[PDB]
């Protein structure tokens, strides 16, 4: 009977989101909704889906996600897993929904809400990337540059000093992947951060 | 962002409903569930758009006039008898 | 309004900004914040924890605590040492 219970819970979450004015009130009402112990992924997934289904990205949903992942630690882990899942399943979303999801996750990352551990799931190699993933990344990084200023971004990328190591973003020195990384990161508009790897091609 | 306009919206929507309640010579709340006012026109309702059905944020009044403090409490808006979540109109309008 | 007690009308509506000035008296600039002043304080000590204190009333400060416990079973004598009472042992004293 979990199909009907899950559908009813999803409907209640959607109605609660749509009957809210500001993100604080929506979070308070969502916290009032009781839910089974292991399905905390469902609330985050429907928050992201509702964000995607709307015409233009409104900071409402980014603020909702940021507040939940700042409320506790389980929500932050849930959101990192949500990003991990949504990256692999991004080829099946149209351009507008992809843009909305990219804005959501970019607002989450730009405020240090989920931590940049998520970037260990990225990899810029043709064997596991598509056009949709490329556009997803460009939108995320453009928003993050705009929000932070491209000044602090190069420190945030240059000093991982944790389990993030950018082994797909900054590819391990092998094959043609470094060329892909460099020309994509200069095509997007970033350019500066790739100068550090620009010397590797000289080295090898 | 204007907390005065929100309570004005609640008040004015409530009095718009009160006009209909008065016209039938009874303004009892049991007689008029939200399905009477907010159900679409083709179903026989009034088709009223709703925004007074939301929580109004509150903060301590001592420091509200002198600083912007965090939202620590919520005062209920128009009450719906039972568990009903009438959708907000603003959620279907994209911000500027 | 104490959250378990009644709620009335203000009885004093004269709080408009006719002075139009903050009086530079209650401003955050020159005040030490340690703990918020709850209304329980304003009701317990009406003349100290709030200005504009008119028509307030004072209540009995304290009463001697009653130490009578009714007997559980009539078979026991009326005068009997209750085990709840701590024993009278105070060998911590320095007398003459």
């Amino acid at each position: 009977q979990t199909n009907a219970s899950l559908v009813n819970l999803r409907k209640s979450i959607y109605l609660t989101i749509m009957s809210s004015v500001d993100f604080e009130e929506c979070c308070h009402k969502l916290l009032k909704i009781d839910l089974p112990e292991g399905q905390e992924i469902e609330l985050c997934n429907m928050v992201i889906e509702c964000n995607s289904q709307e015409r233009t990205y409104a900071k409402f949903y980014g603020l909702i996600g940021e507040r939940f992942c700042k409320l506790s630690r389980t929500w932050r882990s849930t959101y990192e897993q949500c990003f991990k899942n949504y990256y692999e399943t991004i080829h099946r979303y149209e351009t507008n929904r992809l843009r909305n999801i990219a804005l959501f996750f970019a607002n989450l990352l730009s405020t240090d809400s989920i931590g940049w551990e998520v970037y260990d799931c990225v990899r810029l190699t043709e064997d596991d990337t598509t056009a949709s993933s490329r556009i997803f990344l460009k939108i995320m990084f453009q928003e993050i540059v705009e929000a932070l200023g491209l000044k602090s971004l190069v420190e945030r990328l240059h000093d991982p000093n944790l389990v993030p190591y950018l082994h797909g973003l900054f590819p391990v020195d092998e094959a043609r992947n470094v060329r892909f990384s460099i020309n994509y990161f200069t095509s997007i508009g970033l350019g500066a951060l790739t100068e550090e790897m620009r010397e590797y091609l000289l080295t090898m | 962002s204007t907390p005065e306009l929100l309570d004005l919206l609640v008040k004015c929507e409530s009095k718009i409903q009160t006009r209909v309640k008065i016209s039938l010579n009874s303004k009892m709340p049991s007689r008029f569930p939200p399905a009477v006012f907010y159900s679409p026109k083709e179903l026989g309702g009034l088709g009223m758009l709703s925004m007074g059905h939301v929580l109004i944020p509150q903060s301590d009044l001592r420091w509200s006039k002198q600083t912007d403090t965090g939202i620590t409490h919520f005062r209920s808006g128009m009450t719906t008898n039972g568990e009903h979540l009438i959708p907000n109109l603003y959620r279907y309008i994209q911000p500027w | 309004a104490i959250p378990g007690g009644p709620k009335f009308e203000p009885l004093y509506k004269d709080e408009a900004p006719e002075m139009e000035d903050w009086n530079e008296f209650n401003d955050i600039y020159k005040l030490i914040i340690r703990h918020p002043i709850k209304t329980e304080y304003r009701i317990a000590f009406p003349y100290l924890y709030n200005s504009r204190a008119r028509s307030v009333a004072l209540s009995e400060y304290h009463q001697p605590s009653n130490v009578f416990v009714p007997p559980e079973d009539p078979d026991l004598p009326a005068f009997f040492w209750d085990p709840i009472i701590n024993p009278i042992t105070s060998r911590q004293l320095t007398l003459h």
Binding site: E24, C27, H28, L31, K32, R67, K70, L71 | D7, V10, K11, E13, S14, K15, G52, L55, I56, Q58, S59, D60, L61, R62, S64, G70, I71, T72, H73, F74, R75, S76, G77, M78, T79 | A1, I2, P3, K7, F8, E9, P10, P36, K38, T39
Partner: peptide, 29 residues
């Protein structure tokens, strides 16, 4: 009407008062 939260009287507004806690407030030689 309590700790600076609430309106002086529910009469005059379309509400019943009934303030609730935020339940999402972030308490940090």
């Amino acid at each position: 009407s309590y700790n600076g939260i609430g309106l002086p009287t529910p009469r005059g507004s379309g509400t019943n008062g009934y303030v609730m806690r935020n339940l999402s407030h972030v308490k940090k030689v």
